[PDB]
Subunit: 502 residues, 4 copies
Amino acid sequence: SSGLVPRGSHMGTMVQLNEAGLFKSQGLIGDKWVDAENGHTLPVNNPATGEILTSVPFMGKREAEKAIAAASQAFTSWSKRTANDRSKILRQWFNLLIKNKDDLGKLIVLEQGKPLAEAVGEIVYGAAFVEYYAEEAKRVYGDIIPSPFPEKRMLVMKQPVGVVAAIAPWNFPLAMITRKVAPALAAGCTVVIKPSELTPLTALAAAELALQAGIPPGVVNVVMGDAKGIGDAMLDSTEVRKITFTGSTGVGKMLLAGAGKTVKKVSLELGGNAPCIVFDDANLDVAVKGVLAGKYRNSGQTCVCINKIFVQDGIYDKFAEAFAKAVSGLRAGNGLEPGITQGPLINETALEKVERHVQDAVSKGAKVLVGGKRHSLGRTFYEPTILGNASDEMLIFREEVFGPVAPLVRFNTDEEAIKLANNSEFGLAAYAFTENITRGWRVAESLEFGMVGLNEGLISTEVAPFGGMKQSGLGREGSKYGLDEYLEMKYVCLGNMAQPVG
Amino acid sequence: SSGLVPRGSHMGTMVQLNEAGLFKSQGLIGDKWVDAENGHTLPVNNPATGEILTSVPFMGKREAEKAIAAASQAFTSWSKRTANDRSKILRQWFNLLIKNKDDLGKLIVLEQGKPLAEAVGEIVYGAAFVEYYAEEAKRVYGDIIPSPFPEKRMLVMKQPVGVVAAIAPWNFPLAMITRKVAPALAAGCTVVIKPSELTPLTALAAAELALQAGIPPGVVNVVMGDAKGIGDAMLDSTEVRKITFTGSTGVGKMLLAGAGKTVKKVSLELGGNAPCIVFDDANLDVAVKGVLAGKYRNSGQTCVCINKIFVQDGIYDKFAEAFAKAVSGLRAGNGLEPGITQGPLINETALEKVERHVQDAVSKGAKVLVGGKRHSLGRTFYEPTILGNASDEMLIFREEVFGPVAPLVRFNTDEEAIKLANNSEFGLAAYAFTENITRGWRVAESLEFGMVGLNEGLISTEVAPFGGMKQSGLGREGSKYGLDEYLEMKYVCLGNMAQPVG
Amino acid sequence: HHHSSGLVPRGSHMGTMVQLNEAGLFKSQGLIGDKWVDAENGHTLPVNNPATGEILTSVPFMGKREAEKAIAAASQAFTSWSKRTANDRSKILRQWFNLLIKNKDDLGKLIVLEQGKPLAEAVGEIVYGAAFVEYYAEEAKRVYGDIIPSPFPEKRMLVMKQPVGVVAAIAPWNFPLAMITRKVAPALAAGCTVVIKPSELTPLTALAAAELALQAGIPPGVVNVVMGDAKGIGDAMLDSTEVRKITFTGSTGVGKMLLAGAGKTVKKVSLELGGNAPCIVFDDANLDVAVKGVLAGKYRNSGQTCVCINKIFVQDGIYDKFAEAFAKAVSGLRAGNGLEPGITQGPLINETALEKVERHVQDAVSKGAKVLVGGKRHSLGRTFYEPTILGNASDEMLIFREEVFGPVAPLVRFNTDEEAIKLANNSEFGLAAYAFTENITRGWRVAESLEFGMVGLNEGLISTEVAPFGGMKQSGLGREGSKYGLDEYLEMKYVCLGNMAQPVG
Amino acid sequence: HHHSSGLVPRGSHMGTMVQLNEAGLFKSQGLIGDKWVDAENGHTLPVNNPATGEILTSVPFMGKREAEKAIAAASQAFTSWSKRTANDRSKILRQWFNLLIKNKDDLGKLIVLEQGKPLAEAVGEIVYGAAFVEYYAEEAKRVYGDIIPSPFPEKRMLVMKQPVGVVAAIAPWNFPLAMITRKVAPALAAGCTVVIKPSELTPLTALAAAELALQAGIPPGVVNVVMGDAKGIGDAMLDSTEVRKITFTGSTGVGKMLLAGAGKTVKKVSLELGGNAPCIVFDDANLDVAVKGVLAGKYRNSGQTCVCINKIFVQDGIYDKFAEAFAKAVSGLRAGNGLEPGITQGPLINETALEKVERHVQDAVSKGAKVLVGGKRHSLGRTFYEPTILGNASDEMLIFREEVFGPVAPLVRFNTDEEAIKLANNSEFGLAAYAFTENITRGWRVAESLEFGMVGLNEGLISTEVAPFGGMKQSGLGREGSKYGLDEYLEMKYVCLGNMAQPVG
C-alpha cells in the first residue's frame, strides 16, 4: 500500500497548530528557542490515545540559571517602562490569545485530554487574566497619608518585586500560566516559567504569542524537565525575589520551606477538599445542575472541584435520584469528538488514586449508585461515579480524589454540616445550596474556605480573589488583590516641610 | 548600722511601678498569671548597673502549648464580637497605656537602658498602634465586584486568620509588642506573645493593662524562657495560623523555613543596613541633625538606624566637621539621669560586635574622628564614634553594627552612591538629603528599600507601612495595610441570580 | 427668691430644667465666635414643650446681620483650624464625643422637652448623633491622597484632598442632635468651620451641643449657632462668597430654593429632602420579622422620620395574616409625655403636622380606605394622634402620593413582584425603601431594582453612622455617614510634577 | 457633475472634506435615536473655517422639541443599556476607542477645519480625547461596592453603586472631541445614556464621534446629538424629570444659570467653568524648564484653554533673565492655517474672541504695561493675533482680573514667596495654577497653598485622562478623568439586611 502513515491520530490538528506557529518542541531562554544543553528530551503524550505528540527538552539546573540571568537582565528596562506601555503590550498578547483560541483549545485537548468546549473555555478564562492585569497595570496607586508631624509628609509607592519564578500544574495548561505571568508582567516583573512536564506545549504556544505581541526577550522564559533541579535553581537564586506555585501540598510545603533562606515572597495554591452542603430548602434543579458542574468539570481534576457532598435528611432521596440521572447523561471519550463531556484522567497514577478511593469507600460501607469502575474505553477513562452512604472515616472524605467520584454524606442539622465542613486543614473552595437568605449568608460566613459558591457550582473568574486558607495556600490570584503579590510597598517620609501659606 | 539595704539602685522607681500594678514576675496563660511548670526562672538585669531587677519564669514547650490552647479557646468568642465592641476594648487599653506612660517609660529604661525621654516616646509610639487599630477594626471593608455573568453576584469578605504567635526583640520592649498585638486583636485574632528574655517586664505590664481594659482572658497570653522550645511549639501547632517575628535574619529565616510544614502566614522584620546619602546640595544643618538622630537614637540599636553614610565630595569636609561637633554633644549614662542622651548597649555580646566592627574598619584604613573606644563608665557603654575614610570592604559596610558607630564613605556622582546603596541583600530603611526636587524624588524611587527618609532622620510612625524588601522582611506593620496581614480573604459567588426589574 | 416670685415661669419638669441649667446645657442665646449673643434688636422666639404647651425658654430671633457676623467668625477661624494636623482635630473631636456621651441622659431629656419623642428614643438619638462625632474623629486621619501612575515618563502625578472652607448647615426639628452632628462632625474633621442654623422649633439641643464643643476645646469661631429668620439667615449664607458649601436637611420646597440660590456663587451643595418610603411585604416574608420591622420602621418618632415607612404593599397570599398581626402589634403602642416611662408615642411637633395627618386620613377614607386601628386624634388632645392603620389603600390617595410624617400606615394589596416593584419606583422620591422576603434571589433582586438611596431588607431600622445615607431623584444630593460622608467637605487637587528623572538601574 | 456645477460650494481643502465625507465622518444632521435628523422646521446654522472664512457645511438649528425627542430616546435606551454587564459595555466602549484611534488623522483634520488649531495639536486632541473612552471602558468593570462592618450583630450592610440615569452634556468649542468624550465616556461606562449638545461653533467633530460610536455597536438612543438654540435645548434638559444629571463645560455665566435651573428637579450637576491661572516663577526656578513650560502652558491652542496660563508672577532676582529668554521663545511661534506644516498658532475662534484680546491688551497698555513682543493683530488678518508678552503688568489690569483666552502673557514682578501666593489665591477662580522652583520644601509648600483644583509644578502641560480635572471656588463642581470621574455618574445605595444569624463556631 501507498499513503501517509502518521505516528499520531490527530495529525490534521497538529499540522494546523504548526501552520499557525503554535507547536513548539523547544524551551525559551532570552532571545532564543533552545534545546537542553545535552540535547536530552522527554515525550509529551496524548492521554486519550497514548500517542506521543512531540518531545520537548529535558532541562535542569544550568538552563534554569540561564533563564534567571535573562529575566534579571530584562527586568531593568521592562520595570522602567510606563504602566501604559506595559498595558498596551499585554493587551496585544490578550488579543493574540483570543484570535488563536480554537487552535489553542485543541492543543489543550491533545496534551491534557479535557473536552474541546472546556478547553476553549479555558483559553477565554486564561486570556481574561492577561486583559485584566493589562488594565490593572495602570491602577497601581500609591498613597499620601496625613502626617501627625507638621514638618513631615508621608507617601507610599508600590514597585515590582523583581524576577518571579512560576511553577504550574497540568490541569489548566494555559490558565495556570496566565494567572501568574499576567500580574507579574503588569507590575513590571520578569518571569521564569516551569510548566508541568505533562502539559508544556500550551505554555510554549502562549510564550510564542507573547513574543509576537512585542513582549521583549528575557521578560518571559520557559524551562522544563528536571522539576526538582529547576526548582532548586529558583530557590538558590538571590535574583528570584518571588516564587508562585500551584500544585500538590507536599511539593508546595517543600518550596515554602526552601524559600526561607533568601526570604522570598511566596504565593501558593495547594490541595483542596471541597465540601458541598445541600440543605433541605435548596432549589433541587439548581443544586443538581450546580453539583454536576462543580464535581465533573475536567473529570473532577480541579482543586475547586466538589470532593464531598453533605445532603440534608429531608432532601436526600430526591437529590440522590435526580443527581444520578444527571450523572448518567455524561459521555466519556476523546475531547476532539463532539458531544463528549468527560475526558481521560491524566495518567495511570491518577487512575490508581481514583480506584484506591472507590475501593476504600466500598470496604467501609459506601453504596455505588452509578459507575464505580474503569470505563469500557480503557486507558485512564473512569466512569462518572456516585457513592451513597459515605462517612468521615473514608479516604475520599479525608483526601482529594481528583477524579469523577461524588460521595454523599447524609446529615440532620445545619450546625452539624457546617462543623463537619470546617473540620479539616483544607480551606480552598466550599459550596452551599439553600433558598433562604439568612441561612445562605450564615453558611457563607461560617465556612472556613477562601472561596464559597452559594447556589453556584462554577465560581471561577479573573475578577475575584482565588486562593486558600489554612494548608490550602498563601496569597490570592485574580482581582485587584492579585497584583499586590508582585509589588513591594515603600514608605517615603519627607522632612523639613513648611506650613502652607494662609 | 541600721537601714534599708536594697539589692538594686532604683528601688524607689521599682516600688512605684509595683504600687501601680505594673511590675510582674510571672507569665500570663488564659485566666492565670503563672510560673513555669517546674518553678525554674531566669534573671532580668538592668544594663546600666548590672543589678538583677527580678526573675521571671523559664518556660518551654509545655507552657507554650497551654498558651496556644487558651488562645484557641478564646478565639471563637473574640472573633464573633462586632468590630465596634473590639474597638471599644482596644481604646480602653490605649488609654491605660497613655495614663501609665511615665512609669512604663521608666520600666523600659530599667530593663533596656535607653534614655527616659526615648522610653516615654516609645510608650506614646507603641500605644499609637493600639489606638490606630482600634479605629481600623471598624474599617475592614469587604467588596462587591461587578460580575461578568448576569446570573451571578460576587462578594469579598475579610475574616481574622486565627491564633497568632508573636515573637519580639529587646530594643523596643513595648512598641514591638503593640505593633503585632494591636492589629491581631483588632482583626479578631487571639495572640501568644514571646517577648525577648532580655526585656520581658514591659510586655507583662502591657498585658496587665490589657486585662484591666477588659480584654478577655486567653485573648492575650505571654510566655518566655526557652525561646527555641517556645518557637518550635508555635511552629508545630496547627491552631497557630500566623507567625509574626521581629529580630535577627538568621532566626527569621529558620522560622520562615519551619512555617512551611503547616503553611502558616508569616510576617517578618529582619536585619537592616541602612545607607544614608548626603548630596552636595543638602541643607547642612538638616543633614547633620537628621544623621545624628537617625544614627544615635537608642545608641544605634534600631533596625532603621543609619549604618553607613555616603557623603558627596563637595560637602564632605563641611559635613564631617559639623557632624563631629554634633556627636561630641552626646552624653552617656544611666537613662534615669536628666540630660542623658546615650544608654548602654544591651549586653557584652553587643559591645563585642561594636568593637569588632571598629577594629576591622581601623585595620582597613578608617580614621577615628570621634570616640572609637569603650566609654569611661565601663560596662557596655561605648563612646559615640565617627569613622572617616570608610570603604565597601569593611565589616561595618557589609553588616549591621547595632551600635553608636557612624562610618563616612566619600563619593563623586549621584549614580555611584545609588548603585552602592542598592548593592546589598538588605532592604529595610535608607535615607537621603538633598534640597533639589528632581534629585529627591529620583533617589526615593531608585532606592531598593521598604522605607526612605528624604531630609528626615526620624521616620517611625504608626500611620505608615514599615517593613523590608529583599532579605530584610515580609509584610508590613503600621498603616491600613498592617491589618491585612491578620486577615484571610473570602470570595463568595452567589448564583441563580435574577435580572433587576425595569 | 421666695417661691411666689415669678422671674422663672413655674411649670412641670422644672426639676429637669434646673438640672440641665446646672450642667450648662440650657441656653437662651446664640453663639458667634467667642461670645454667646442675643439678636441685635433683642427680639426672641419661644421654645414650647409639645406635650404640655409650656414655655421652656426663648432663644434669639436673629437675621441677616447676625448670620454675616457668624460667617466672618467662621472664616477667620478657618485658617488656623484647617492648618492643624488631622490628629490634633481628631483628639479635639473625640473630647466632644466623650462629653456628649457623658451628658447623654440630660441631653436626651432636653430632646424630649422640645421635640416630644419618648425618652428611650431621645437617649438613643444622643448615642447615634454622638456616633457621627466619633466616626469622623477617626476618619479625619484617613483623608488619603493618591499617587497615580503617569503615562509621561518625565511627570509624576498626585492627588491631595483639602477642606472646602466655611460650611453653612441647616437642620430640621425631628432629630435635634443627630441632624446637627451628621453635618458638623465631618465638616470639622475635614478642617472646615461651620455656621449652623437649627430648626427654630428645636434649637436648645444644638446650643447644648455647641456648649460641649467649646468645653471639648473646639476653638471659638469654628462652631457658630444662629436662629430666627430662617429666610434671611439662608440668604446671608447664599450671598456670602466665604461660604463654600451648604448642607441642608428638610423639606423639598426649601431644599430646591437653596439649590437654585447656590448657583450664583457655585457652592458645593448636599441635600436630604422628602421621602415617601414604600415597604414591600412578599408572600414568603417571615411574618414576625415583617410585623416587628414595619412597626419599628413606621411608628418610630410617631412616624416623624424621613426614612419612615409611608406605604406598605402586601402580597395577596399574606395580606390577611399580616393585617391581623400588624393591627395587634400597633394596638400595644402608648401615647403620652415622653418623660413618663412606658410611653412609646410622643406628640406631633405642632398643629400644622396634626392637620396634615388628619388631611391624609380623611382623603384616604373618602377614597375607600378602611380604618383598621385608630384614625382619630388621641384622647390626650394637643397634637397627639392615635397610631393608625388604613386597609384597602390605593395610588390615588394623598397618603400614597405624599409624605404623611405621622403615625398612619396604609396597606396596598398587590399580586405580582413586578407590579409592586414598578409601583414602588413610580415616584420622584428616592430616599428609603423596605422589603421583606425569605428568598435569596428575590431579596437581592428587589434590593437592586428599588430606585432608592437606602433599602432595608428584612429590617425596619436601618440608621447607622457607618453607612451612606441620602437620596436619589428629588430626595437629595450627597451622602451623610460612612467614609463617603467626608468627601462632601473636601476639594480634590491634582498636582503634576514635571522635569522628573528616570530611576537609576 | 461637470466641475462648473455649484451644488457643493467650491473651496480650499476640498480634497480633505471629500476624504472625510468618504469615511462617513462629515455630517450635516443631528442624531436622535435610530435616525440622523434635520430640525423640524429645516432651519440650519453654518459651520465656517476660522482660518479661511469658507463654509464647511450647515448643521440643523434645533430647539426644545428635538431636545425632548432626544431625551425620550435616551430614556427608552437606558433600561437595556444599564442592565448590560459592565464587561459588555466595556467591550463596546473599547470598540469605539479603537475606531477613534483608527480615524485619528482625518478626525484631527476636521478639528483643524472647524476650530483652527494646528494639525499636530488636533491629532494630539484625538489621542487625548480617545484616552477617556479607553480609560472608562476599563473603569466600567471597577465600579466596586462595599460590605461595611455592622455594629449590630443581627444586621449586614452593603453599598451598591448604580448609574444615575439620562445625562445631558453641554460642551464648548476649544476641544471639539475631548470635551465630548470626557463627559460621554464615563456616562456610558456607568450605564447612563446621553443627550449631547456640542458648541454650535464646532459640532462636526461631535457628529463624527457619534457616527463612530454607532459603528462600534453603541445601540441607538444611548448617544444622541442635538444643536442650535442652546438656550431652548438647555431649558428642555433642565425641565425634564428623566434627565437626572447635567454636565457642562463653558463660561461661568452660563454655568451659574444651569446650576440655578437644576434646583427645581434636584439634578446632579458637574461644571467646569472659567479659569484665570496664575503661574509663579521663583528665583530658584530652572530657567530653561520655566521658559519651555510657560511657552507650552500659555500658547497651546493660541491661549484658548481653561487651564492656560493667564498671568505670570516672576520673582525679582530672575525677572530680567526670564523676560529675555521667554521673549526669544515666543518669537519662534508661527501663525497660520493649521493644515500647513510648521504652523504653531491658529486663529482665534471668532471676532468676539479677537475683540476681547484687543480689549485686554489696550487696558494693560493704558495702565502702564510694556509690550515686549507682539501686541497687535497678525498680518494674516481675520482673527489671527500676534503672540504677545506684556511686561510691568499689575493687579488693576483687566488681564489680571479676567480670563483673556488668547495668546497674551502678562508678567508681574514680585519680591517674596508669601506675596506671590496670597496674590495667586486672591480670586474666585480655582481651576489651574502653576509654579516653577527647584526646591523640594518650596515646591511642596506652594502646591499645598495654592487654592486651585490643579497645580503644575515645574510643568506647563498637565492634561491627562488619569488625573482628576476640575475647579475649586467659582471654577466648577465635580471632576473629570481618573477613577473619581466615574462617581459623578453613579448613585450610591446602602442595603441593610436584617434578622441575620451569628456564624457557627
